[PDB]
Design a binder for this molecule. Structure first.
Ligand SMILES: *[C@@H]1O[C@H](CO)[C@@H](O[C@@H]2O[C@H](CO)[C@@H](O)[C@H](O)[C@H]2NC(C)=O)[C@H](O)[C@H]1NC(C)=O
Ligand code: IOQ
Ligand code: NAG
Length: 547
């Protein structure tokens, strides 16, 4: 009952940590819009949490391992809360928020946010290295796995509360309470709407300050650091762990864009409902993964073989994506001739057609256009439609120049806005995609406890915190910040139309060749998986040869 009490407090701190993370990302757009700030400065401010975290994660790990640990964790949580409160003072010190079509037919105080994010990042560092090593040092024969599984399962209450109230706070006017809301002309659907972003940080800061009260009642550096980097098993494990986590990060970063470009679901069918059933599977997988290791009495090689088996069984489900793909969308003008007559070889420098010769409009324009013929037009002017239907339900343009078709003359040449959806087969395949995805997520969550349970076992009983700290540092550096950058750089090789911004020729992409997208995305993930898997198998051979 002395470890049980310490066990409760750490759960509260885990919840607070996750809440703070998801809060920060949720409030970034409003801050950019309220503060009148550049995009480079936004990329900078968002990166502060990393400058504070990566700078002191190793020193707190080593030097804090011989002081009072429960008190260090409480001090860290208090610093995190104080930093969370500091991010909301600009609102109280600045002033009031002063600021308060295109159919086109044929045409012939930021330092405060920075230094608060830095304080938060500096403050969360003592939770994982000093908490888990404390749990491992004082525990019975096999209960460390079960405890870590319960901990990782309980922590999912942070994202729930965050997503719940960050969406409720983003539908209030920013100056709520000081102004009377009856004279406000702006609505959440406008372009200048800023919500109450300062209210997201008060609740998180006070929660982090509250969750730290129970904790208050419960020359060698260099050789200790060199004695850890000459241990082969540790280096091999860290490497593969890195490869696998990089693969996961990239996949979860671009799955939502892949699903939209491949199958056609508009980020609301595939987004909201999915998570509601995707999170309990993760929680149950984590808890059961811990419970199995506890119940079956596994040693080091047993844990290694169990996690290798889970990795294999989760990689065998990943290679089924290559077999449920659809055909490529057809947009007249992009890859085919503007009159549908013939195919082309270059996405660039397609010539204008007879049906569209007279109507001189901006090619750079990208407005969804689809006629009853089934194909796609870049713009209502590029299709030749010289009529409208008013601001009613999407205005059906009519009597189109390039919508005319043989045998279609005896019909209604009228194109609705919005791309014509895919056939039924593509939906039927989307359902198989979702099923396989939840299966792979379950089988990859069943083995997430083994990393900590192995790093602790393959290292001297006194260098447990330093090892976990260096592991966390390397992973959060080379697999959380680099991972999205290279995947994104690689993916952009498959664009066929760019949104030419005022200065930058590439503001964003309109469409992407779906076949090459799937090729690059799934190939990178599969190659990384094999990479990490290989290292682990060899590692198992070395382990079995050692003991
Ligand atoms: C297709 O465009 C032609 C030429 O603009 C339209 O021709 C006339 O449009 C007005 C109003 O409908 C009237 O002069 C006649 O009803 C149309 N016929 C002609 C040639 O005089 C035509 O209406 C358009 N497509 C439709 C709706 O039939
Ligand atoms: O970023 C994430 O990576 C994984 C993930 C994270 C950990 Cl620690 C783990 O132990 C397993 C794991 O499994 C997957 C598998 C995937 O196919 C994708 Cl596409 C993301 C994640 C994940 C699961 C649930 C929410 C977010 C993530
Ligand atoms: C389109 O089809 C329906 C029925 O014929 C009606 O809207 C009208 O007669 C046709 N012409 C257009 C473009 O509205």
């Amino acid at each position: 009952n002395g470890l049980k009490m310490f066990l409760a407090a750490l759960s509260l701190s885990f919840i607070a940590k996750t809440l703070g993370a998801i809060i920060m990302k949720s409030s970034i757009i409003h801050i950019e819009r309220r503060f009148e700030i550049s995009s480079s400065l936004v990329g900078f401010i968002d990166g502060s949490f990393e400058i504070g975290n990566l700078l002191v994660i190793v020193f707190v790990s080593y030097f804090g391992s011989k002081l009072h640990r429960p008190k260090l964790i409480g001090i860290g949580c208090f610093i995190m809360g104080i930093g969370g409160v500091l991010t909301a003072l600009p609102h109280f010190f600045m002033g009031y928020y002063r600021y308060s079509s295109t159919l086109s037919t044929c045409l012939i105080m930021w330092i405060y946010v920075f230094m608060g994010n830095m304080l938060r990042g500096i403050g969360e560092t003592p939770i994982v290295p000093l908490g888990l090593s404390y749990i491992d040092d004082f525990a019975k024969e096999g209960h460390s796995s079960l405890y870590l599984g319960i901990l990782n399962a309980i922590a999912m209450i942070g994202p729930i509360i965050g997503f719940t109230l960050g969406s409720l706070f983003s539908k209030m006017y920013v100056d709520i309470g000081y102004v009377d809301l009856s004279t406000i002309r702006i609505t959440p659907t406008d372009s200048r709407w800023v919500g109450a972003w300062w209210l997201n940080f008060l609740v998180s800061g006070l929660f982090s300050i509250i969750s730290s009260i129970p904790f208050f009642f419960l020359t060698g550096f260099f050789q200790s650091f060199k004695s850890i980097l000459t241990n082969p098993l540790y280096v091999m494990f860290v490497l593969l762990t890195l490869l696998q986590v990089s693969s996961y990060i990239g996949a979860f970063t671009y799955v939502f864009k892949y699903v939209e470009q491949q199958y056609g679901q508009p980020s609301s069918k595939a987004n909201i409902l999915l998570g509601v059933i995707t999170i309990p599977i993760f929680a149950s997988g984590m808890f059961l993964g811990g419970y199995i290791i506890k119940k079956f009495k596994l040693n080091t090689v047993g844990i290694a073989k169990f996690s290798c088996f889970t990795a294999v069984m989760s990689l065998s489900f990943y290679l089924l994506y290559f077999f449920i793909l659809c055909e490529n969308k057809s947009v007249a003008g992009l890859t085919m001739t503007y009159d549908g007559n013939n195919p082309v070889t270059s996405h660039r420098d397609v010539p204008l057609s007879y049906c569209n010769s007279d109507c001189n409009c901006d090619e750079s324009q990208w407005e969804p256009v689809c006629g009853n013929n089934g194909i796609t037009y870049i713009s209502p002017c590029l299709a030749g439609c010289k009529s409208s239907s008013g601001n009613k339900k999407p205005i059906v343009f009519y009597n189109c120049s390039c919508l005319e078709v043989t045998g279609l003359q005896n019909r209604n040449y009228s194109a609705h806005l919005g791309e014509c959806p895919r056939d039924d087969a593509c939906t039927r395949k989307f359902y198989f995609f979702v099923a396989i995805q939840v299966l792979n997520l379950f089988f990859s969550a069943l083995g997430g406890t083994s990393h900590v349970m192995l790093i602790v076992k393959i290292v001297q009983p006194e260098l447990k915190s330093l090892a976990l700290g260096f592991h966390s540092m390397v992973i959060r550096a080379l697999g959380g910040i680099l991972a999205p950058i290279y995947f994104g750089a690689l993916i952009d090789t498959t664009c066929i139309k760019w949104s030419t911004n005022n200065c930058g020729t590439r503001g964003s992409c309109r469409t992407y060749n779906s076949t090459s997208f799937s090729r690059v995305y799934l190939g990178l993930s599969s190659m990384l998986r094999v990479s990490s898997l290989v290292l682990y198998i060899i590692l198992i051979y070395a382990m079995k040869k050692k003991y």
